C-alpha cells in the first residue's frame, strides 16, 4: 500500500470547505436547463441597482412616509434641509437598501457610491438645491458656506426630474470596514448635506409642500470582502410550524 500520515485538521468539518462528495442518487438525470430571464452571477450586480433611502427615519413618519423628504418655501436664505449619515453598519437611512443589505453580509468595502434624488413636486414648482459630500475629519457642516467647500452638485429643478450626487471613493486605505465604531478612521465616510440654493417657489394653486425621494447605489468600482453573517436577521425561537416537520 501507500504509506501515509494524517495532518492536523484531518476529520474536521469546515463549513467553507470545497470538496467532492459521494452522490446519494447514482445515475440521476437532473431536469434539463431552461432559459430564465434575470440571471444573476455576481452580487455586485444587485448593489448597482438604485434603491430608496429612508432619509425621514423619525418618530413622526409612519410607513412609506419615511421614504420621502418634504421641502417647503422658506423665508430665510441658505437654509439646511436635511443630512444623511453615511454609515452602512449602523442603523441609518442607507441600511435597508440593496447596496446596504448586500454589503452587510460582508466586512470590508471599497468604491464610489451615487445618490440620486427625484423631485416630485408639481410641474409649476421651481427651485435650486445644493447637495454636498463632506469627507470625514470634522463635524457635519451646518451652514451652506461651509458645506459648499466639499464635493457638491447644484441641482436645478426642471424637465429632468432627477440629479445624481457622486460620493467618490476618497479613502486613505484600500478598504473601509463595517464596524460598530462609527467614529473609527477605518469606517467613517463623512456626511451628505442638502441646502436650499435659492428657494422652493410654487404658484398658489400648486402644493406648497413638495417631496424628494432619495436613491442610493454603488458604482461598478464597488467591491466587498470577508463574508459574515448579516446582523439584519435573527431568531430566538423556532418558527411556527417548524416542529410539525418532524411530525
Amino acid at each position: 500500500g501507500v504509506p501515509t500520515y494524517l495532518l492536523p485538521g484531518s476529520g474536521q468539518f469546515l463549513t467553507t470547505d470545497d470538496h467532492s462528495s459521494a452522490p446519494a442518487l447514482p445515475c440521476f438525470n437532473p431536469t434539463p436547463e431552461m432559459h430564465i430571464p434575470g440571471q444573476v452571477r455576481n452580487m455586485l450586480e444587485v448593489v448597482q441597482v438604485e434603491s430608496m433611502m429612508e432619509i425621514n427615519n423619525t418618530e413622526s413618519a409612519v410607513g412609506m412616509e419615511r421614504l420621502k423628504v418634504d421641502i417647503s418655501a422658506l423665508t430665510d436664505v441658505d437654509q439646511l434641509l436635511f443630512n444623511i449619515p453615511l454609515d452602512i453598519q449602523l442603523d441609518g437611512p442607507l441600511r435597508n437598501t440593496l447596496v446596504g443589505n448586500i454589503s452587510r453580509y460582508y466586512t470590508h468595502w471599497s468604491g464610489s457610491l451615487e445618490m440620486t434624488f427625484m423631485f416630485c413636486g408639481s410641474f409649476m414648482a421651481a427651485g435650486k438645491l445644493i447637495l454636498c459630500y463632506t469627507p470625514p475629519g470634522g463635524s457635519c457642516p451646518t451652514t451652506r458656506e461651509t458645506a459648499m467647500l466639499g464635493t457638491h452638485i447644484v441641482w436645478d429643478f426642471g424637465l429632468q426630474s432627477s440629479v445624481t450626487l457622486i460620493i467618490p471613493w476618497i479613502s486613505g486605505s484600500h478598504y473601509r470596514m463595517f464596524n460598530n465604531d462609527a467614529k473609527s478612521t477605518n469606517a467613517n465616510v463623512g456626511y451628505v448635506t442638502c441646502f436650499m440654493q435659492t428657494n422652493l417657489i410654487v404658484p398658489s394653486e400648486s402644493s406648497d409642500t413638495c417631496s424628494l425621494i432619495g436613491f442610493i447605489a454603488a458604482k461598478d468600482d464597488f467591491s466587498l470582502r470577508l463574508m459574515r453573517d448579516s446582523p439584519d436577521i435573527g431568531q430566538l425561537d423556532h418558527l411556527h410550524a417548524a416542529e410539525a416537520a418532524y411530525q
Binding site: 462528495s21 447514482p26 455576481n42 424637465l159
Partner: protein
C-alpha cells in the same frame, strides 16, 4: 479531486465571472447616452 462517476458530485464552481448588470440597471428599450438628457 473527483473520482465519483456522477458529475453533480463535483466540488463547487467559482469561475463564472460573466456579468450583465444592465439587465437590472438599464432594462429600457432605448439605451441612454452619456451626458445627453434622458428625457
Amino acid at each position: 479531486i473527483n473520482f465519483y462517476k456522477d458529475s453533480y458530485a463535483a466540488s463547487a464552481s467559482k469561475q463564472d465571472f460573466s456579468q450583465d448588470p444592465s439587465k437590472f440597471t438599464e432594462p429600457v428599450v432605448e439605451g441612454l447616452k452619456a451626458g445627453a438628457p434622458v428625457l
